[PDB]
Amino acid sequence: AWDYDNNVIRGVNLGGWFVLEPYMTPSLFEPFQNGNDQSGVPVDEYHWTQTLGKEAALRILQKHWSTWITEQDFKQISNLGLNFVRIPIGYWAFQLLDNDPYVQGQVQYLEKALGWARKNNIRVWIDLHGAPGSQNGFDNSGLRDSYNFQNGDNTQVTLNVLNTIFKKYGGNEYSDVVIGIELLNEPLGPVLNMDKLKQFFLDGYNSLRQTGSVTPVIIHDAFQVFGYWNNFLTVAEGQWNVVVDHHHYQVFSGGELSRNINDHISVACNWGWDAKKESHWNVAGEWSAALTDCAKWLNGVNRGARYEGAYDNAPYIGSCQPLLDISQWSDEHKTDTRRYIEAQLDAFEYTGGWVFWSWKTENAPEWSFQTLTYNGLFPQPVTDRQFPNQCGFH
Question: Which CATH number goes with the domain that contains 42?
Answer: 3.20.20.80
Over the chain, what HEC string results? CCCCCCCCEEEEECCCCCCCCCCCCHHHCHHHCECCECCCCCCCHHHHHHHHHHHHHHHHHHHHHHHHCCHHHHHHHHHCCCCEEEEEEEHHHCCCCCCCCCCCCHHHHHHHHHHHHHHCCCEEEEEEEECCCCCCCCHHHCCCCCCCCCCCCHHHHHHHHHHHHHHHHCCHHHCCCEEEEECCCCCCHHHCCHHHHHHHHHHHHHHHHHCCCCCCEEEECCCCCCCCCCCCCCHHHCCCCEEEEEEECCCCCHHHHCCCHHHHHHHHHHHHHHHHHCCCEEEEEEECCCCCCCCCCCCCCCCCCCCECCCCCCCECCCCHHHCCHHHCCHHHHHHHHHHHHHHHHHHHCCCEEEECCCCCCCCHHHCHHHHHHCCCCCCCCCCCCCCCCCCCC
Q: Which residues are within 8 A (CB) of 46 and not within 5 positions of it... i.e. 6 or more apart?
A: 100, 101, 102, 142, 143, 144
Q: At what angle do helices 106-119 and 45-68 cross, to 10 degrees?
A: 40
**Which residues are 282's β-sheet partners?**
244
Q: CB neighbours (10 Å) of residue 282?
A: 24
Q: Is 342 annotated as a binding residue?
A: no
Q: CB neighbours (10 Å) of residue 260?
A: 9
Type of residue numbered 278: E
Whether the bond between 358 and the residue before it is cis, its omega within 30 degrees of 0, is yes
Count the alpha carbons within 13 Å of 63 in the hemisphere toward its beta carbon. 8
Q: Is 256 annotated as a binding residue?
A: yes
CA distances 239 to 171, 205, 206, 249, Å, are 18, 8, 9, 30
Q: Catalytic residue, from 45, 278, 286, 342: name it.
A: 286
Kindly compute the dihedral angle of the four CA atoms of residues 326, 327, 333, 339, in this order, to the nearest 10 degrees.
Answer: 70
Nearest residue to 91 via CA among 51, 127, 63, 131: 131
- Catalytic, 286? Answer yes
**Which residues are 86's β-sheet partners?**
13, 125
> How many Å apart are CA 201 and CA 205, to the nearest integer?
6
> How many Å apart are CA 234 and CA 269, to the nearest integer?
27
End-to-end CA distance of the chain: 28
**Which residues are 355's β-sheet partners?**
11
CA 193 to centroid of chain Cα atoms: 23
Provide the domain count of the chain.
Answer: 1
Q: Catalytic residue, from 45, 186, 278, 342: name it.
A: 186
CA distances 157 to 95, 136, 161, 183, Å, are 8, 16, 6, 13
Nearest residue to 22 via CA among 45, 56, 38: 45
> How many Å apart are CA 156 and CA 175, to the nearest integer?
26
Nearest residue to 87 via CA among 181, 20, 14, 16: 14
**Which residues are 316's β-sheet partners?**
308
- Catalytic, 186? Answer yes
Q: What range does the domain containing 68 cover?
A: 1-394
Q: Is 349 annotated as a binding residue?
A: no
Phi-psi group of 286: left, alpha or beta (phi > 0 → left; psi -120 to 50 → alpha; rest → beta): beta
CA distances 393 to 156, 276, 286, 348, 389, Å, are 43, 10, 21, 11, 8
Q: Is 249 annotated as a binding residue?
A: yes
Q: Is 374 annotated as a binding residue?
A: no
> How many Å apart are CA 28 and CA 363, to the nearest integer?
13
Q: CB neighbours (10 Å) of residue 155?
A: 22
Q: Tell whether the torsion through CA atoms of 129, 132, 138 and 144 is positive or negative.
A: positive
Q: Give the pairing type, strands 353-356 and 178-182.
A: unpaired
Nearest residue to 32 via CA among 49, 15, 54: 49
The answer to whether residues 249 and 255 touch, using CB atoms and an 8 Å cutoff, is no
Whether the bond between 381 and the residue before it is cis, its omega within 30 degrees of 0, is yes
Q: Give the pairing type, strands 242-248 and 353-356.
A: unpaired
> How many Å apart are CA 243 and CA 229, to the nearest integer?
10
Nearest residue to 43 via CA among 219, 383, 299, 369: 299
> How many Å apart are CA 76 and CA 304, to the nearest integer?
33
Nearest residue to 336 via CA among 287, 292, 274: 292
Count the alpha carbons within 13 Å of 295 in the hemisphere toward its beta carbon. 24
